[PDB]
Amino acid sequence: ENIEVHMLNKGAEGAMVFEPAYIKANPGDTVTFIPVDKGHNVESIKDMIPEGAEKFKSKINENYVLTVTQPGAYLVKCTPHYAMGMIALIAVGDSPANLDQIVSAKKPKIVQERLEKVIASA
């Protein structure tokens, strides 16, 4: 199964967002990041991907297809815009073992607010 994600300068949540910012997936699913607006990419945040997942980072403005294998939570950011709160949370499988850790991890305040919201909403 594939889930399309748009990288936008403006969305329901404000400036610099991923839509959806919450992706529920299963091992083997693919997540396609589409740069609706230019200037975006997708990058795994260090220590915010599950044990054993491979780190990734797409090139600015390219359509990136992520294959998710390892269950757990993945916090991804848009490199240039992370500080402006551009992140998405990918939850692979049930009860991501590393979700409390990601929630607790050091990250920008805006990031934290958006994270809390996406999670609250799931």
UniProtKB/Swiss-Prot annotation:
Keyword Hydrolase part of the UniProt annotation: no
Cofactor binding: number and manner: Binds 1 copper ion per subunit.
CC cofactor: Cu cation
Keywords of this entry: Copper, Electron transport, Metal-binding, Periplasm, Signal, Transport
GO MF annotations, alphabetized: copper ion binding; electron transfer activity
Induction (UniProt): Under anaerobic growth conditions and by nitrite.
GO cellular-component term (any): periplasmic space
Disulfides per UniProt: none
List of residues binding Cu cation: H40, C78, H81, M86
Sequence ranges assigned to domain Plastocyanin-like in this UniProt record: 5-93
Major localisation: periplasm
Localization terms from the record: Periplasm
Role of this protein: This soluble electron transfer copper protein is required for the inactivation of copper-containing nitrite reductase in the presence of oxygen. Serves as a direct electron donor to the nitrite reductase.
Protein name: Pseudoazurin
